Amino acid sequence: MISPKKDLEKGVVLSDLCNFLVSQTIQGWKVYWAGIEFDVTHKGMALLHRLKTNDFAPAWSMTRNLFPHLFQNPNSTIESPLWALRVILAAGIQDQLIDQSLIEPLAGALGLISDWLLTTNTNHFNMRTQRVKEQLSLKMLSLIRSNILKFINKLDALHVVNYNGLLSSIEIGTQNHTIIITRTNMGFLVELQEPDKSAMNRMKPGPAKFSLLHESTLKAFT
Amino acid sequence: MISPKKDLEKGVVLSDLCNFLVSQTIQGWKVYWAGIEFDVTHKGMALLHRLKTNDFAPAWSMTRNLFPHLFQNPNSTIESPLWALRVILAAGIQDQLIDQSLIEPLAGALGLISDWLLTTNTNHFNMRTQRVKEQLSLKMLSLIRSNILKFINKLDALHVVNYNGLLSSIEIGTQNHTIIITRTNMGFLVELQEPDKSAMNRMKPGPAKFSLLHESTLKAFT
């Protein structure tokens, strides 16, 4: 009976993809999504808040000056590392959602999941256009998993911010946002801007949300 | 929201642990259990059947003479590589969780799952009695997963059968069986005997089941 075909598969896949499980640890959080464990920490978050102040705390002076649209912008707000993880996961899905045929239901199913991760803070997503729940399969879940792993490795291939021409950030457009992920000495700065990146208008900065994903979270995937 | 409490968490963990999802592939099967993907092949199974006959492999006779309780035993049967994987997963739970500290929390929940994997061919286990179900949490699913990985690494540390000092097999006792896993040139020979290993009584051989897990399946975890 493990061999003959069934509804059980779509059910398990639905459960893994439409739930973002979070468990508190001393260090931060354990997260479980798509059958993948992530260890998220809140180290580094205090420094982020520090940099939002004018406390001159030198040596980080450079970092704040590299990201004035984040640290010197009354319209930018700090989110938690859990949000940072959600944004990176949405970005990974998008970065391999973009090349899909307008099938569309599978691309639609991915878009729904990506959208839920990116723009909400809930632990559960109710997909009920179930012409896409039947787009849910173990094949689709495997594809999502391998491509999340591929995206995480792309991030690990980034160099820390530099003046040596070496790539240090990735930008991903979504339907209603621009996602930017930049490797810094603090870890990965994850930001969410408008599609026009108005936060970058140094004379009159638009809105942004940002946070930090500590290097340790990606190290497990190497 | 992602920060509430835990009927959702328990459902997801239950779904991953009590379902053994299988999709057929050209080379064999894709398996999904406990949020882990396994790629199983039936490459090598024809050779097992050949060895169950007389002659056809003078070069394999040395490998073959190590296992007369398997290849020269009318009470031994060849099972599929899927069975081999289930036996290894059951062995991993037994060896790395049930047999170390006397798990309370609950050895019982682990014991039920292990028993289902080991002795049935079904895709789903209906865990009843609502206090083994509530012993299910993301913590512990995490524990089950890391200990499966450690057991797989233990298998990968085994040497192929040899006449030097080198360890090539692991034996694990369970409630009603003996599990033996031996690394050979063919891959991992997985066998299931009675607790007294009656299959090894050469004049009056008891029953045994066995199969082969190709090296490739474990290599993915390194």
B4 neighbourhood in chain A, CB within 8 Å:
123
What one-character DSSP code corresponds to residue B198? G
Give the domain extent around B59. 1-222
**Best CA proximity match to B124, nearest among B3, B18, B17:** B18
The count of other CB atoms within 10 Å of the CB of residue B48 is: 20
A123 neighbourhood in chain B, CB within 8 Å:
1-4, 8
A 144-183 residues with CB below 8 A of B? 145
Report the amino acid identity of residue B90: A
Q: Dihedral of CA B197/B203/B204/B206: which sign?
A: positive
A21 touches chain B (CB under 8 A): yes
| Residue of B6, B30, B32, B38 to mutate, interface with A, max A Cβ within 10 Å | B32
State the method. X-ray
CB nearest A2 (choices: B20, B142, B145): B20
B54 touches chain A (CB under 8 A): no
A7 neighbourhood in chain B, CB within 8 Å:
none
**Best CA proximity match to B2, nearest among A86, A13, A12, A78:** A86
To one decimal, the resolution in angstroms is 1.9
Query: Three-state SS string across chain A, please?
Result: CCCCCCCHHHHHHHHHHCECEEEECCCEEEEEECCEEEEEECCCHHHHHHHCCCCCCCCCHHHHHHCHHHHCCCCEEECCHHHHHHHHHHHHHHHCCCCCCCCCHHHHHHHHHHHHHHHCCCCECCCCCHHHHCCCCHHHHHHHHHHHHHHHHHHHCCCCCCCCCCCCEEEEECCCCEEEEEEECCEEEEEEECCCCHHHCCCCCCCEEEEEECHHHHHCCC
Phi, psi of B155 (to 5 degrees): -65, -40
Inter-chain residue contact B30 with A3, CB threshold 8 Å? no
Rounded CA separation B122/B133 (Å): 19
Q: Looking at the 3D structure of chain A, how many domains does it have?
A: 1
Question: Helices (H) and strands (E) in chain B — how many of each?
Answer: 8, 8
Give Cα B68 distance to the centre of its chain.
21
Looking at the complex, report in whole angstroms how far the Cα of residue A96 sits from the nearest Cα belonging to chain B: 20
Rounded CA separation A31/A82 (Å): 8
Inter-chain residue contact A21 with B36, CB threshold 8 Å? no
β-sheet with A208-213: strand ranges across: A76-78, A208-213, A187-193, A178-184, A169-173
Decide: B198 and B205 in contact? Cβ < 8 Å: yes
**Best CA proximity match to A70, nearest among A217, A175, A210:** A210
Looking at the complex, report in whole angstroms how far the Cα of residue A37 sits from the nearest Cα belonging to chain B: 8
Inter-chain residue contact A30 with B3, CB threshold 8 Å? no
Decide: A138 and A9 in contact? Cβ < 8 Å: yes
A42 neighbourhood in chain B, CB within 8 Å:
none
Q: For chain A, what's the residue count?
A: 222
**Best CA proximity match to B151, nearest among B185, B175, B117:** B117
Looking at the complex, report in whole angstroms how far the Cα of residue B121 sits from the nearest Cα belonging to chain A: 6
Decide: B41 and B217 in contact? Cβ < 8 Å: yes
